């Protein structure tokens, strides 16, 4: 890839995941070298060698994966070479990634390479956007930052013992064992206030307690309240369909509601929950740009719509119209979709279930099934008002869900095109002035004729 | 073939019949494997309830294989595609990979290991399902997900006791003094005593209290610097799930009291008396101790056009079927009437309607008492209780009314009194579709009228045109159409 | 007299029941737990429980004698009380809290407190009695946090006496982690008791610990189950100050969401600097001077009634002195209050510039209008709060000379808050006041000249109609034509 | 002069006075409870105390000085701010804040710096000057955290102090928990005092415990009590912090929610892949530039004349360049750019089609347009920003050919942000201006070539007459075809 997209590609989220290492080695083992004495003249080349990787892990950044990195300008993606780096040198990345490259044998002179921090920023929206359900993940990165915030406590709880000298008193490290994970247990028991560490006794091991006893409770608190909007963020929507769920009962249970309409009402709120996991879509419809939700709307149902033979002719626009206008309702099983005498309005187009048509003698006879995709009661749509009546009984099989467009709404589609407006009634006036006026004169005339005729002879 | 339906209460009992020996792996397969006391003891009474746990276990996956889904809107009972569903999820893998009889491997290791059994815990799904549908299932879903939430805590505690015990013999009992003692003491050898001071160890570390002997080996440190900072994620996870639950449950007080403190701010903003005022705490007083703060257009907006149909004819069919106009009129219009309908809330005191006002609306009594008073309001005529009506003729707008859409009566609301009100643009949009229906009430409203005594142009400008326009087009073309008979006559001769 | 549940008498009886209930919750376990703290004060509790006992007679009699809402109104008959009252469950709660146990003190002995614990059951009244102070006290937070506190102190208190209870069952001295020998001189008084019980319950119920550790299994297993009851505890503490919290600055929340869109807006959209800096101050302004919220979705959430009350009290008078409605019928002013809009302005503002199209009619409420030249430094007139202008604009009045242009330019001084009437807004509640249209109209066309300002289309129709039947009787007659030569052809041939 | 207490000015008064009362609310109880402290830097301490009442005094000044809004105006009248200052509480608070209780010095002597906590009174406007920084800095949250600290810091101290006096009733070194005895040389310390007793308070006050158990009957008391009130602040800070992360988070939390949304719309509605990645794609951009909030909701809590202003200022010029737009009245443009509706679209998005109806003017913003040749591979022109079409079917223009419908395909290259007028809109605008729409169709008129009821009946009377001479002609030409066949029969 000559040009590399920011965004969507895998290979760069791997290389910024490399960055991101890079960092969190330098991040985590500047204050464990500054603190501890573990970089000896023996192992000191180990470390000069990984920090070497480091900062050429941080030269291939700045200069040859971030200048291929394709930008927007006015919402248009740029490609050319030159471009991407004028937007990379003007932006201010490369100032931060500059201010690291600067080199300025002390583990504290290697400080700013911590100012490369932006790169695990874009690492955390890139792993928030490519997988879903991402509160895991950010829980887990609160727990980095905490284990982050308790290794630097770890490291100045050391830096503290080596100042007052190692096992001088109680308080300070004593300098038996790892010398690593001693300190990490202060610090564990310290920055989260757990307790149970030898008392402070000199003004300065008491000075250190103290704050870092403040620093552990607001870093609990940070923790804690991490947690909580996680668990608040991830149940939201359960919260919400419970709430609403509860406020139906509630209403029903005040007005008398009978069991049977309280259970249908309960079983369409769990069914609806659990297959389209919200309550509504036009309310995530209206939120959508006009053009996203008027492209969704034909990749759902275009071609079903112009499979209809009643509005072939007619106006894109106006299909189009009528696939904004469309809205699902749920049918339960055993439920009436038309019923046989009532008021047709409504022209159903089966998105999912199955619908039967019902007939015969006496009724519970299924006449035709129609499955997902096929529309009926097209021609209600156009009536005058009051002269469409459902000839036969329909019923929904299962749990169907019927994309609804009634009268009302396509009448206020046909006011806005006249063409496809008179198309319509023509074919409503071809299913079922002039020539009537000749045809009255001329039988008239005959009428008026043969009473002449009659009284002459 | 018996299809067991997944939303009935066949499969909710049977999701606790398999909840119960899964509880039990996840609990006791861990306690056996590291208090090997436990599992010596009572090795029949373990053996016993393995076997019925792997019986149970295998009934589960014949439900699996019974268990019917939701195709297309239908429940399916094709047996080879019910098994067919079953195998191609990863459950199927997961109950295969729980009912291994790994229990074999005792012959080969001896009845001291039953971590053998730890496949078994592999059907926590279906413990994980249990606990959610008796989530959506429970009239107390706060108080289940505190139990819930609790017992997850306690299972987790009961596993890093479990876990502390077998790190303590690993390093051995009594070694130091953070492991646990040695079990030779007649005190601290009682299994009882060895598995609750691991419990009292594993509750201090998992919920960050501490005050337990402080480790001594540096794979001590690294135990306890592990299990302190899972005790922090415990923590931090049930301080936060309760704190969720608590804002959830008071949400709507908290919706409430900030739609309260609005409505006092914009009523000291525009510097509204204070007797208005205090009528407006007392109807929030009423609203909120009444609990009728919901909205039923709000409640209700979700629902579909069938079942909020179903609802609203449950609640106003027989009242409005007993005005006297919509008597008569068709099922689908009363449907339509009724949910065109409008609650209205009054207080004591107030008024409805005063003689003169415009009568647009035709009020529904459904709890509370209206009187009609006079123009004084200290007398009162007649008191309409719940199920009453008035105002029917002002919506059916009759040409040759005396009052002309306007109140003739002032009706005054006892007490709290809950109205729905039908508009007349509703009326007349549901009489849209039913001209016949709307005719007949026209009709009808006549007759009340007149048995009470209170009864006594661009549009054909451009017709007129456009019919000339289309006779023309029609006289061209018969003209031209006769033309072809004079043509015809012409070279006939 | 029957007791309004509502009212000021019925709160400060829930006080007065309150403080028995919360004397037994306590006191009653802290007698039973500690011995001596009966023993010691026996004739004050007995004074105390008896008392309690007729407070508690009284909330029965007040329980019959307590109205509630039916049919909108307050139900005032005795033996309806009485029947409602008995139905609830409160009324066996009652009857258990009341059942004369106080006779066990001659069987079991003076020093078993415990027969009290049935008065326990009144806890309804406590709870019931915080609700109403919830919603009725100006300080909800702080009482909130009072009540927590309170609910805390209690549950920490019974904590304490289990503990003491638990120790005295054990047996005080036999091990560290019981309270110690009461024979000693210090831990023997009962100050001391109940000092140190409330120090051990505060440790443990607050997830701090530093106890003495538990020696026999039964103590590890209270310790355990009484440190995760602790953090319940405390995590419903940190979650109920937490939903505190977030209730107190979800408007500053909400506000600053608000603030930050329309900075996200301004720098999206490149607007001016200066243009920035306004926006910024007048949101400022809106906080500082509590003017948030907008007045529409404030009113929406009042009732239709209510929200009517609350917009003639507060429009009505400054209507009335308009001139052209100064003579107008009362339900016509009550629609146009309803129609006004709110406008508010920034010092520095025009309302209307000379040649803008003039539509609507402002009102100042509050606020200075200036009436500015061309250069704007020139004052003509200052128009103060109850002052209008644009009120002919809004009458479509034929032969104006000034047609529906601005003849002045408006400018506001300081932070003008206005209401306008829009010319739509006036023709949609004159559609239903022809004649006060029609005398509107007049008046206006009056003003005008004071102040110097100022069916033969369906008779064509029927000759349309006969038109179109002589035209086509010309083409049935070319038919007939066209028939008779065509037989003639076919006769000649 | 008069000071704005919007201003500037009020702020850094405000801050000038926010120094004293810290200084009092911290240090009088520091030295009331420490003997030591007010012992030793006694001429500090006064000077120190002389200078804060002297800035009560500039404060009470600056509250006469202090003006009001009344009647949306500032009131400047001396009279007036005085006596709104005098029946104010706060002047009363003031007064108490500022009795010479330091007279009280001379009789209990030097040792007794608790006569001044009547200056704690000033702590309405210490917390009228921490809501004047929380709303007005540019980091709500860092200060609002930081706010939080101060005040956990005050009360710790406080308790700290607190916990030293009672050690000092009791007893130094009586027994274990009081602080021990300050003959001690190292305990003696005044900063190990204040250290040990600001650490002590923060361990009991926040829910740590560590400190050596009470002894003494009240030291369990206070013990107790202190623990009750360190639940009540550690649960605080917790409330505090999680509210903020709600509220640094929501904006992220609500377009989460719209992507799981949409995401599930799409996976329950059998969208193709591909429209669910443009979906994903589109989303992803308007969140990574600020543009995934919708305008209307932005705009609307402003009120009408502040969005007038900001929608003139981002749209008159831009509107002004149409060119027929040219040359139109002020009002007209400033109601032209109220009806503009924002559009945005997607790469390979079809503005509009050839055949479609035209009924509104599409001004481009942020975006690049092209017009393609039906197939979408090669494009005749590319509309870069500020260019516009639809400007002439927007006019209802007789005699227009191709007039109603769109000529050209408009298909949008990137992600292109658009403002469309309806027709609707423009003829809404153009009710109230006559002239200007009658100008507006002769501009069209010219850009394309490069009394009613009685008029109306009027027109269908010579219609009539026109329909009379075609009747007489017809029966005129009826008897002669009659008289035709005659003369053949």
Known sequence: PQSIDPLTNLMYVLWLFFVVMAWNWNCWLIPVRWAFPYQTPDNIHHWLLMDYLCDLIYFLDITVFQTRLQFVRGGDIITDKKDMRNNYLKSRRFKMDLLSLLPLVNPLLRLPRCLKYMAFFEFNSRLESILSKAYVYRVIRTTAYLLYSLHLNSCLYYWASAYQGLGSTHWVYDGVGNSYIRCYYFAVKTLITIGGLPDPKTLFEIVFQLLNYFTGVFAFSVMIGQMRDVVGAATAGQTYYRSCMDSTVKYMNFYKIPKSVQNRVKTWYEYTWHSQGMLDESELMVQLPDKMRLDLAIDVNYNIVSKVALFQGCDRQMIFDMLKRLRSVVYLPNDYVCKKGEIGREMYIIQAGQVQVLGGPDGKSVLVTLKAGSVFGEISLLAVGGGNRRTANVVAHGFTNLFILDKKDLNEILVHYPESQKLLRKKARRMLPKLFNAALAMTGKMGGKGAKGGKLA | ?493
């Not at chain 2, 006791?28 to 208090?35: E, G, H, Y």
């Not at chain 2, 019986?55 to 019917?68: C, E, K, P, S």
């Open chain 2, 1 to 493: 073939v018996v299809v067991i339906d997944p939303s009935g209460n066949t499969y909710y009992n049977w999701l606790f019949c398999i909840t119960l020996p899964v509880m039990y792996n996840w609990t006791m397969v861990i306690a056996r494997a590291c208090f090997d006391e436990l599992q010596s003891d009572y090795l029949e009474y373990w053996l016993i309830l393995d076997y019925v746990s792997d019986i149970v276990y295998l009934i589960d996956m014949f439900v699996r294989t019974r268990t019917g889904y939701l195709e297309q809107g239908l429940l399916v009972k094709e047996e080879l595609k019910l098994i067919n569903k079953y195998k191609s999820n990863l459950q199927f893998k997961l109950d295969v990979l729980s009912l291994i009889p790994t229990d074999l491997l005792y012959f080969k290791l001896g009845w001291n290991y039953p971590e053998i059994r730890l496949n078994r815990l592999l059907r926590f799904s279906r413990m994980f399902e249990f606990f959610q549908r008796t989530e959506t299932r429970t009239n107390y879903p706060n108080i289940f997900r505190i139990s819930n939430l609790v017992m997850y805590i306690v299972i987790i505690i009961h596993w890093n006791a479990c876990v502390f015990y077998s790190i303590s013999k690993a390093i051995g009992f009594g070694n130091d003094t953070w492991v646990y003692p040695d079990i030779n003491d007649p005190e601290f050898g009682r299994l009882a005593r060895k598995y609750v001071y691991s419990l009292y160890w594993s509750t201090l570390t998992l919920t960050t209290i501490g005050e337990t002997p402080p480790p001594v080996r540096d794979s001590e440190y690294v135990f306890v610097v592990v299990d302190f900072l899972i005790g922090v994620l415990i923590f931090a996870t049930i301080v936060g799930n309760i704190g969720s639950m608590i804002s959830n449950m008071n949400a709507a007080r908290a919706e409430f009291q900030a739609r309260i403190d609005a409505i006092k701010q914009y009523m000291h903003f525009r510097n509204v008396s204070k007797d208005m005022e205090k009528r407006v705490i007392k109807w929030f007083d009423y609203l909120w101790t009444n609990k009728k703060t919901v909205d039923e257009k709000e409640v209700l907006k979700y629902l579909p056009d069938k079942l909020r149909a179903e609802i609203a004819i449950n609640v106003h069919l027989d009242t409005l079927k007993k005005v006297r106009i919509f008597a008569d009129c068709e099922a689908g219009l009363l449907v339509e009437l009724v949910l065109k309908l409008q609650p209205q809330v009054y207080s004591p005191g107030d008024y409805i309607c005063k003689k003169g006002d415009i009568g647009r609306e035709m009020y529904i009594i459904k709890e509370g008492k209206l009187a009609v008073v006079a123009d004084d309001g200290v007398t009162q005529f007649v008191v309409l209780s719940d199920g009453s009506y008035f105002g029917e003729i002002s919506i059916l707008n009759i040409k040759g009314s005396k009052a002309g859409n306007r109140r003739t009566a002032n009706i005054k609301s006892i007490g709290y009194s809950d109205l729905f009100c039908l508009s007349k643009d509703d009326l007349m949009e549901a009489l849209t579709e039913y001209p016949d229906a709307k005719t007949m009430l026209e009709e009808k409203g006549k007759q009340i009228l007149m048995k009470d005594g209170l009864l006594d142009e661009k549009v054909t400008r451009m017709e007129g045109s456009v019919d000339l326009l289309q006779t023309r087009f029609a006289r061209i073309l018969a003209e031209y159409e006769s033309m072809q008979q004079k043509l015809k006559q012409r070279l006939t001769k």
